[PDB]
Amino acid sequence: GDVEKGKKIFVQKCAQCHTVEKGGKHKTGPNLHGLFGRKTGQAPGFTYTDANKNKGITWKEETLMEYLENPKKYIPGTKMIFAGIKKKTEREDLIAYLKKATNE
Amino acid sequence: GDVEKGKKIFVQKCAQCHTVEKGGKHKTGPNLHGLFGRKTGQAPGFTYTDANKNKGITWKEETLMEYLENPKKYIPGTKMIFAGIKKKTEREDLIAYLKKATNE
Numbered sequence: 001g002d003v004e005k006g007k008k009i010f011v012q013k014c015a016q017c018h019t020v021e022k023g024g025k026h027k028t029g030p031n032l033h034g035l036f037g038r039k040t041g042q043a044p045g046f047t048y049t050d051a052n053k054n055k056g057i058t059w060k061e062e063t064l065m066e067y068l069e070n071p072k073k074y075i076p077g078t079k080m081i082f083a084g085i086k087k088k089t090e091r092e093d094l095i096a097y098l099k100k101a102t103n104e
Numbered sequence: 105g106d107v108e109k110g111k112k113i114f115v116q117k118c119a120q121c122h123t124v125e126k127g128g129k130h131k132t133g134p135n136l137h138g139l140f141g142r143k144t145g146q147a148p149g150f151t152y153t154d155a156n157k158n159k160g161i162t163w164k165e166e167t168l169m170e171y172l173e174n175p176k177k178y179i180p181g182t183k184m185i186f187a188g189i190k191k192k193t194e195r196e197d198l199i200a201y202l203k204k205a206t207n208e
């Protein structure tokens with residue numbers, strides 16, 4: 001495929017949760033350097049779900065083609081995001097803002 | 105709670121998928137203006153999951169406190185994001201970029 005086009009997709013759809021750079025940080029999702037030819041759930045230092053840990057397949061063009069079409073269908077139980085707010089005080093403050101902004 | 109603090113949480117944790125402004129657009133998630141005192145799944149023009157459509161509760165401080173702690177526990181079946189790429193050519197181009205960047 002077209003690398004130029006792929007880079008833009010990555011930046012728009014994936015970079016908010018993944019880095020690709022050697023030595024790049026884990027974010028919501030794992031750093032992806034060295035992905036190709038590696039089994040699922042094997043970035044060093046990242047805590048996966050059991051589902052992503054145990055999928056047991058090798059990442060390559062064919063498996064990525066299928067995964068990317070629908071990640072949850074290829075790895076049921078995978079979790080991409082936690083959209084909540086665990087701290088009580090942060091929940092109270094956020095709700096205060098929402099109470100104001102969603103009514104003005 | 106503290107509105108100043110809530111605004112920053114919102115911008116950091118929620119604004120990527122929700123607007124709060126009257127007349128604001130639906131994004132990944134619904135526009136949230138008029139939320140308080142309204143039942144779940146009722147922003148006009150947004151297509152919810154059946155789960156969020158049918159939760160049947162009224163949004164207010166107490167219900168938001170519980171929802172925000174863990175959205176999926178409060179509304180099982182709710183879906184926050186699709187992280188995949190439906191178009192075949194976009195998948196091919198993205199995979200080409202990944203093949204380069206994750207190996208250099």
Ligand code: HEC
Nearest residue numbers: 013014017028029040041042048049052078079080081187
């Ligand atoms: C956050 C909201 C994410 C977005 C957007 C994308 N991904 Fe993701 N990805 C995310 C998490 C939390 C995980 C771990 C999931 C688990 O169940 O533990 C993943 C996983 C991957 C993988 C597999 C990685 C591995 O097995 O080592 C791949 C190949 C992957 N993600 C790629 C990817 C791409 C290309 C994305 C843009 C289209 C993308 N993800 C979006 C979090 C998030």
Ligand code: HEC
Nearest residue numbers: 083117118121132133144145146152153156182183184185
């Ligand atoms: C995208 C990755 C999201 C992030 C981050 C947050 N939310 Fe969200 N939210 C999202 C979607 C797709 C939906 C609809 C879900 C469905 O099952 O149909 C929601 C829903 C809400 C609701 C309920 C809205 C209603 O019933 O009308 C609320 C109150 C809500 N979201 C608030 C919210 C806040 C405060 C967030 C930051 C902490 C937040 N969401 C993150 C998508 C995403």
